[PDB]
Design an enzyme around this catalytic site. Structure first.
Site, short mmCIF file in Angstrom:
data_model
loop_
_atom_site.label_atom_id
_atom_site.label_comp_id
_atom_site.label_asym_id
_atom_site.label_seq_id
_atom_site.Cartn_x
_atom_site.Cartn_y
_atom_site.Cartn_z
N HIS A 69 -18.37 6.12 18.40
CA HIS A 69 -18.95 7.28 17.69
C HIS A 69 -20.20 6.71 17.00
O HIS A 69 -20.10 5.91 16.06
CB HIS A 69 -18.03 7.86 16.63
CG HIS A 69 -16.88 8.60 17.29
ND1 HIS A 69 -15.62 8.57 16.71
CD2 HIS A 69 -16.79 9.35 18.42
CE1 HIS A 69 -14.79 9.29 17.47
NE2 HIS A 69 -15.49 9.77 18.49
N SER A 70 -21.37 7.14 17.50
CA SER A 70 -22.63 6.53 17.09
C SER A 70 -22.97 6.52 15.62
O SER A 70 -23.53 5.52 15.18
CB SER A 70 -23.78 7.06 17.98
OG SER A 70 -23.65 8.49 18.11
N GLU A 72 -21.16 6.06 13.07
CA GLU A 72 -20.32 5.16 12.24
C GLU A 72 -20.99 3.79 12.20
O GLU A 72 -20.37 2.81 12.65
CB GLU A 72 -18.90 5.17 12.87
CG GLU A 72 -18.35 6.61 12.73
CD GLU A 72 -17.14 6.86 13.57
OE1 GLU A 72 -16.45 5.95 14.09
OE2 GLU A 72 -16.82 8.04 13.82
N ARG A 127 -22.47 12.10 16.76
CA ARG A 127 -21.21 11.47 17.12
C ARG A 127 -20.95 11.19 18.61
O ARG A 127 -20.36 10.15 18.98
CB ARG A 127 -20.07 12.39 16.64
CG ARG A 127 -18.65 12.10 17.11
CD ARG A 127 -17.71 13.19 16.55
NE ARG A 127 -16.32 13.08 16.96
CZ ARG A 127 -15.29 12.51 16.32
NH1 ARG A 127 -15.46 11.92 15.13
NH2 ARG A 127 -14.05 12.47 16.83
N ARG A 145 -12.31 11.19 23.07
CA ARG A 145 -11.41 12.28 23.51
C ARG A 145 -11.45 12.33 25.04
O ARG A 145 -10.85 13.22 25.67
CB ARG A 145 -11.83 13.65 22.94
CG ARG A 145 -11.84 13.78 21.43
CD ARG A 145 -10.38 13.69 20.93
NE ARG A 145 -10.32 13.88 19.48
CZ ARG A 145 -10.60 12.90 18.61
NH1 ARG A 145 -10.95 11.67 19.03
NH2 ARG A 145 -10.56 13.17 17.31
N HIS A 196 -13.61 2.25 14.15
CA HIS A 196 -14.32 3.47 13.71
C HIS A 196 -14.54 3.49 12.20
O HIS A 196 -14.15 2.51 11.53
CB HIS A 196 -13.31 4.65 13.94
CG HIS A 196 -13.11 4.93 15.40
ND1 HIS A 196 -13.74 6.05 15.95
CD2 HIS A 196 -12.43 4.31 16.38
CE1 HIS A 196 -13.43 6.08 17.26
NE2 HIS A 196 -12.66 5.04 17.53
N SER A 197 -15.11 4.55 11.66
CA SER A 197 -15.19 4.72 10.21
C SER A 197 -15.20 6.26 10.05
O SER A 197 -15.52 6.98 11.01
CB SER A 197 -16.38 4.06 9.53
OG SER A 197 -17.55 4.84 9.71
N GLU A 270 -10.09 2.30 10.88
CA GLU A 270 -11.03 3.28 10.33
C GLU A 270 -11.54 2.54 9.06
O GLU A 270 -10.75 2.38 8.12
CB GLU A 270 -10.43 4.62 9.95
CG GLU A 270 -9.82 5.32 11.16
CD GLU A 270 -10.89 6.19 11.80
OE1 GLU A 270 -12.05 6.25 11.34
OE2 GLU A 270 -10.58 6.80 12.83
#
Ligand SMILES: O=C(O)[C@@H](O)Cc1ccccc1
Ligand SMILES: [Zn+2]
Length: 307
Positions: A69-70, A72, A127, A145, A196-197, A270
């Site tokens: 996810h860009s 983050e 994202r 996903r 991720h974050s 996360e």
């Protein structure tokens, strides 16, 4: 940065800076690190993985990816710090040295290069990937996903304009298929970590089903140990549990896929924080985040080496 020793780890960088960093590292530690190109993104940027190894032939390995996810940004920043740390700690830290002496580590710092470039040029909070969805004006798929693990079930959107759009079919995104082919071809991965974050969580499977994994007791104990290790440096508090029970129902996520392939030690971290800054975490928190996350990751690696 003319040397990985002059690169600024306490600031956020662009895609070119990170790609240049990879070549500096390989140049400086040719015997330990190699740069592999596992594919090309939708917009044609190379997809690179750093391989850390002390030899052997197809040693059991650990996969670590960051930046799916860009927006983050803390994840790509932590990935650069990890790459450097691996080269620093080998031969200094007994524990890390024992791991590399028997296992290989594959690190994908920028899993979604097109979205990362977009976060720098046009929309800091992007994202998804940047694939063009045929029957829509909306661009991109949520690459977390798009995996073949309860693909298209609840926990993902069917609308191209959604932030959680799953795409046309499992593995439609080249950024995802590139990883799937590589891991399937290797066949000797023992751990799979996806970073991720934000939220400060350590998660294990599953996200797409309420069914409990057969290895729940062990993974729960490993998670507990990893969060205790991570907390030890700065007191950063993480929660842990399966995805569905801890965050929400999410279908087509990577760690559900990896676990279903038999890679037992499948976890998602996360990172910081819990909402004060969210995706826009200050550059001043990069190093502390990286350092504490390393203790959590190292704990999982140690368990892997032994079980
Ligand atoms: O929505 C997301 O992608 C993650 O933050 C939560 C997650 C991790 C792993 C698998 C599924 C979901
Ligand atoms: Zn994410």
């Amino acid at each position: 940065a003319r040397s990985t020793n002059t690169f600024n780890y306490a600031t956020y960088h662009t895609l070119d800076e990170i790609y240049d960093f990879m070549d500096l590292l390989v140049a400086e530690h040719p015997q330990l690190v190699s740069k592999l190109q596992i594919g090309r993104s939708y917009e044609g940027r190379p997809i690179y993985v750093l391989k850390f190894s002390t030899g052997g032939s197809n040693r059991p390995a650990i996969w670590i990816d960051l930046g799916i996810h860009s927006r983050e940004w803390i994840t790509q920043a932590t990935g650069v710090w990890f790459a450097k740390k691996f080269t620093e700690d080998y031969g200094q830290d007994p524990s890390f040295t024992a791991i590399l002496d028997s296992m290989d580590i594959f690190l994908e710092i920028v899993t979604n290069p097109d979205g990362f470039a977009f976060t720098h040029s046009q929309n800091r909070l992007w994202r998804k990937t940047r694939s063009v969805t045929s029957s829509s004006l909306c661009v991109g798929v949520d690459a977390n996903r798009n995996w073949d693990a309860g693909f298209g079930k609840a926990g993902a959107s069917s609308s191209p304009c959604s932030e959680t759009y799953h795409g046309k079919y499992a593995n439609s995104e080249v950024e995802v298929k590139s990883i799937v082919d590589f891991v399937k071809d290797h066949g000797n991965f023992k751990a799979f970590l996806s970073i991720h974050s934000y939220s400060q969580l350590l998660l294990y499977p599953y996200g797409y089903t309420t069914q409990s994994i057969p290895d729940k007791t062990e993974l729960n104990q490993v998670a507990k140990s990893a969060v205790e290790a991570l907390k030890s440096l700065y007191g950063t508090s993480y929660k842990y549990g399966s995805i569905i029970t801890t965050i929400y129902q999410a279908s087509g996520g990577s760690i559900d896929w990896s676990y279903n392939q038999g890679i037992k030690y499948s976890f998602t971290f996360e990172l910081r924080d819990t909402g004060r800054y969210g995706f826009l975490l200050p550059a001043s928190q990069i190093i502390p985040t990286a350092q504490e996350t390393w203790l959590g990751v190292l704990t999982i690696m140690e368990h892997t080496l032994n079980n």
